[PDB]
Amino acid sequence: SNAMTQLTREQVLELFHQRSSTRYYDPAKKISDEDFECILECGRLSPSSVGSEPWKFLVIQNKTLREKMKSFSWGMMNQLDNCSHLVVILAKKNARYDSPFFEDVMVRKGLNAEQQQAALAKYKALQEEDMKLLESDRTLFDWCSKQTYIALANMLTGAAALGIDSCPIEGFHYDKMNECLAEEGLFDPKEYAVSVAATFGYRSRDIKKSRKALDEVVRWVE
Amino acid sequence: QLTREQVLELFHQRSSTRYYDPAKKISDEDFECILECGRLSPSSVGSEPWKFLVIQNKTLREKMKSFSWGMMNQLDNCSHLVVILAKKNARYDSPFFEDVMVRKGLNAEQQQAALAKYKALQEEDMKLLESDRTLFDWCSKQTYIALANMLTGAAALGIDSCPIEGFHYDKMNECLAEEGLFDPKEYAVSVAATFGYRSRDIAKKSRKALDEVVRWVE
Ligand SMILES: Cc1cc2nc3c(=O)[nH]c(=O)nc-3n(C[C@H](O)[C@H](O)[C@H](O)COP(=O)(O)O)c2cc1C
Ligand SMILES: Cc1cc2nc3c(=O)[nH]c(=O)nc-3n(C[C@H](O)[C@H](O)[C@H](O)COP(=O)(O)O)c2cc1C
Ligand SMILES: O=[N+]([O-])c1ccc(O)cc1
Ligand SMILES: O=[N+]([O-])c1ccc(O)cc1
């Protein structure tokens, strides 16, 4: 890393202040294919526990599907008509250490058989004892869903770095959204479920930050 | 504003560092900038349901080793360690949520309408109220946004990091509560992260191809 591959502290703070939730999009302004691919890359390159990458990104451009969405998506009703791109992020269901899904996770690490068994033993303990994820199907799904929020965050920040506005979205009926997207054939509902969404585009109305102070959220243990 | 190549370089510079140089410390100003990236993160309903515990005490780090397999050696060598807490019991009808509404400036009528909207969000749209753990996990998801932004902001400053789940969560929560750092009825440990400077080159790890993870619905 050097001064040319870094941002200054001033530039980092500007980036994270600029990143904001846009609720009014200009329908006449579309993100270029290349800029949007870059945004998706920010999601794809995100870290994830155990390298599990337990996400799928559905890019919902079809206008008829966006319209149907409106009736059960109160949190983005006024964005569905005018945003450039909409991403619905799915998270993997039943991502147990002993599942076929986890074999592919391991294969792309390029480990030998002994390293693979050492890794698997770590991941079993992580799920079973340390994080207690096998309490229920939902607990294990929510673990994958947490990893998807990393990908979400990175797509919002990457978009902001490109000068592109965005809004993270939880304001929809999850059962209705899962049912609709599965009925459209967009994923196997036994294997994935909706985690979170995000809109992207260019704002048509102005957005300053309101946050708790650093001293109210940070505690130093020296 | 950055070029596409610069944005890509940032996310490629960001890697999970397991081997830290124990002689390299992050400056106070750089670390405050990292914390700002967490503080400035978005969160559902603007709930900001997090606390960032900066664990620099060496005796406390040494105690954690016995139940933190995923960062055992990082604890000896990293510059800074953050344990992020998430709010427990963040119900729409809790005082925690009332404070959110008030500081947004909502009047009495608007607060009543907002309570109804977020009741519906939690009870029906997201079904967060199935159990205490489902509601906690909602706040925990928001903290993963703050985590991600800290890792990326650190990388932008030239500072290495590693997100951490590899510890016994209940033992960590018991320890940190015994230290008096939070009220365990109000918060619980969500995720951690180390920060510092790598002691060797970190081979870039693989990812599934874009075509594997993206589906276009046109
Ligand atoms: C939430 C989360 C928890 C993780 N926990 C650990 C951990 O405890 N110890 C560890 O060495 N790596 C941990 N990792 C790092 C992942 O193994 C790593 O992100 C993945 O292998 C991809 O490598 P990269 O981030 O270098 O691209 C974790 C990652 C995330 C996102
Ligand atoms: C996971 C998540 C879901 C959210 N859901 C919605 C939503 O459905 N609709 C909306 O208008 N804003 C939504 N927001 C945006 C938040 O209200 C916003 O992040 C917060 O008020 C802080 O504002 P800022 O992002 O402009 O800094 C969501 C944020 C997060 C992180
Ligand atoms: O050792 N561990 O508990 C780990 C190691 C890697 C990881 O991504 C998560 C947990
Ligand atoms: O309309 N909604 O459901 C919302 C709106 C804003 C938000 O942060 C979360 C949910």
Residue numbers in the entry:
A (entry chain A): -2 to 204, 206 to 220
B (entry chain B): 3 to 220
Q: What did the published study say regarding this structure?
A:
Phylogenetically diverse bacteria can carry out chloramphenicol reduction, but only a single enzyme has been described that efficiently catalyzes this reaction, the NfsB nitroreductase from Haemophilus influenzae strain KW20. We found that expression of H. influenzae and Neisseria spp. nfsB genes, but not Pasteurella multocida nfsB, allows Escherichia coli to resist chloramphenicol by nitroreduction. Mass spectrometric analysis confirmed that purified H. influenzae and N. meningitides NfsB enzymes reduce chloramphenicol to amino-chloramphenicol, while kinetics analyses supported the hypothesis that chloramphenicol reduction is a secondary activity. Previous kinetic studies of nitroreductase catalysis revealed that reactions progress by a double-displacement (ping-pong) mechanism that appears to lack the gating steps necessary to impose specificity, explaining the substrate promiscuity of these enzymes.
Hi 12 NfsB showed both the fastest apparent maximum rate and, overall, significantly higher activity (>2-fold more active; q < 0.005) than Hi KW20 NfsB as measured by catalytic efficiency (kcat/Km). This movement appears to be supported through an interaction with the Met74 side chain, in which the S (Sδ) of Met attracts the Trp71 aromatic ring through a long π-π interaction (7 to 10 Å). For structural changes specific to substrate binding (e.g., nitroaromatics), as opposed to coenzyme binding (e.g., NADPH), we focused on comparisons between the Hi 12 NfsB structure complexed with 4-nitrophenol, the Nm Z2491 structure complexed with nicotinic acid, and the previously published En. cloacae structures complexed with 4-nitrobenzoic acid or NAAD. The 4-nitrophenol molecule, complexed with Hi 12 NfsB, takes the same position, although rotated approximately 50° around its hydroxy oxygen. We have identified that the NfsB homolog from H. influenzae strain 12 exhibits the highest chloramphenicol reduction activity thus far, likely due to increased flexibility in the small loop between α3 and α4 in the active site.
